[PDB]
Amino acid sequence: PTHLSVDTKFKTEGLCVDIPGIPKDMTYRRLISMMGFKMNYQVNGYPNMFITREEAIRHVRAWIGFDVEGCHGTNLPLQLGFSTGVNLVAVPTPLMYKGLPWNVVRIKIVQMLSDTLKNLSDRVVFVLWAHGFELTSMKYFVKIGPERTCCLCDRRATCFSTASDTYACWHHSIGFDYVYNPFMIDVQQWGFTGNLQSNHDLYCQVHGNAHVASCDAIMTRCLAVHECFVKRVDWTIEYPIIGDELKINAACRKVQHMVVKAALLADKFPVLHDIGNPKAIKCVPQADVEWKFYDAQPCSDKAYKIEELFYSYHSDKFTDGVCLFWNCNVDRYPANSIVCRFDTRVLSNLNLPGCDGGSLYVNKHAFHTPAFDKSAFVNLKQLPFFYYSDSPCESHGIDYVPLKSATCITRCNLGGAVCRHHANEYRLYLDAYNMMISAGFSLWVYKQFDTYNLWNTFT
Ligand SMILES: O=C(CCCc1ccccc1)N1CCOCC1
Ligand SMILES: [Zn+2]
Ligand SMILES: [Zn+2]
Ligand SMILES: [Zn+2]
Structure with a gap:
């Protein structure tokens, strides 16, 4: 029991408003397929897009809260919010950027994650309070495959470029357009009664809800941090040296x-x-x-x-x-x-x-x-x-x-x-x-x- 088994069950109750009629019986394997990803029975170090709480705690430096709010879902524009305070609006044709297509939005997502994570981690972990749109929107900016190394160094690949057919880490991804082999965890799978704001506001008064996607992304990572490091403490877990x-x-x-x-x-x-x-x-x-x-x-x-x-x-x-x-x-x-x-x-x-x-x-x-x-x-x-x-x-x-x-x-x-x-x-x-x-x-x-x-x- 090292990684999260793809045959584990995924509670889909939190997904049924954005996704009506979703099967109550769901596995990670089926959810990944629904998200548009083909794991193709690959024994190459990426067993699951989703991860355990233990694995997320060991990779806390990589956490990026992610939330998608459907402004108007194929025909409607989406608001993409990150725990960095960024809000991007994607059209299908608290830093709030205007409506632009996915081909330019993905360029910005790679730049933002790379500038945020290059000095913290070898990966990204999308911390979610999953309702549907964030999982369906992942196919527009995420590519998956075997574990790879950077085109300019020995670090693992976290980005991909369709322009050159190459892979890069967070340090060498300038001009790259796809997030490669990211990770994610859905906080709702942990067993909560009620919505995100009600659980978040039980422990924190510093984050508010301006009603933008980035506000939920922040409350999501904050609630995850409280659960894993405030109410639960594990000082045995070592972390790599990334600075002084x-x-x-x-x-x-x-x-x-x-x-x-x-x-x-x-x-x-x-x-x-x-x-x-x-x-x-x-x-x-x-x-x-x-x-x-x-x-x-x-x-x-x-x-x-x-x-x-x-x-x-x-x-x-x-x-x-x-x-x-x-x-x-x-x-x-x-x-x-x-x-x-x-x-x-x-x-x-x-x-x-x-x-x-x-x-x-x-x-x-x-x-x-x-x-x-x-x-x-x-x-x-x-x-x-x-x-x-x-x-x-x-x-x-x-x-x-x-x-x-x-x-x-x-x-x-x-x-x-x-x-x-x-x-x-x-x-x-x-x-x-x-x-x-x-x-x-x-x-x-x-x-x-x-x-x-x-x-x-x-x-
Ligand atoms: O730098 C440290 C650890 C120092 C070691 C330590 C202090 C007190 C109790 C047991 C162990 N911290 C960060 C700031 O808050 C306090 C802990
Ligand atoms: Zn590199
Ligand atoms: Zn908070
Ligand atoms: Zn002297």
Whole structure:
């Protein structure tokens, strides 16, 4: 049981208004044939156009919500909506484009999917709330066959060109006109009572229904994301490396050791309350402090209420010392805290749009993160950049331009001139810090944090 069997049953109740008289008994095999596609008993890596929920979760980077609304069905013009906000109108002869034939519409579909997916995935997954028109319209822009490779590279083929009879991935498909071997999943097959808007609005207030095809496409992918990543969580599923993942994660570990070590030197807290990761390690292992851990998994729905995490009767007094919340998203942080909060609004290849203002952050694992709220940090301030080192000024073993910086907190800078070792280390740390901030993470600290207090750790 790897793929979705074509002999599985497809509930056709949701299809009978666009398609009256549809057989209640339907299989994927028969539905595909009804859609105008000939699978021709092909044992070449594309066993089914439709996929399982497990396969869709593993390929979430490829999800594109798709909806078709019949404006006037052979004689009538269709509105093609995608979760990218695009609305295309096809004639048979929230970006709303005017009526054009299928030969030009398919050119736009390939360009749009390619520009959206080239840096995220090796495929497309049309996430549907199937009523009929979207499945019947697929023959006008989709071609199927064996699994292929690109005409210009080793990546799998996702596009086809009738002009040249060639195949291409999302990176090399300029001027291609057909979507090749796409995937799809119908959310209605999951078992819902009622229409799309009623199920969507149960969990999300950020997406509305302007009554265009793209609005339903968005609500569809959002409802799919809530079901697969908000209400259900699976942090065991690994995801491929598609960007700066390894650099971002290494930067996060360097920043955390730096920021926490400096707070313990500047304010010498006797106890640190580490709230978050049940698998956490002491990020400053040589520190004197009483390190106490508290387990809390990443909240995917709503941010943790500080009352439920702390109270109900540990040192008991979280007011003693400092509380470290490294990616532990709470509604309002206590004033004595060190905090790393992921900003869900950040635009990147790792951050996919989520449910109720939240986002799906995919870095090794998929983490649905609640909406970034600036009010969570009223008792704290933004942590400013600084680099601190108490290592000896020894070069050992790139070239050099003298470093002049007020934020290089070192004995050499105290003494008047940054040594080459600390200048290399400072610039490497500044790069790691910038990496992490640009990845979307934000750093917050208690209002009394002052880097001026670190100069006296050199006596
Ligand atoms: O980057 C991460 C994972 C950090 C690791 C972790 C944090 C808290 C509990 C268990 C594990 N996230 C994205 C932002 O929201 C929070 C989770
Ligand atoms: Zn290619
Ligand atoms: Zn939504
Ligand atoms: Zn030095």
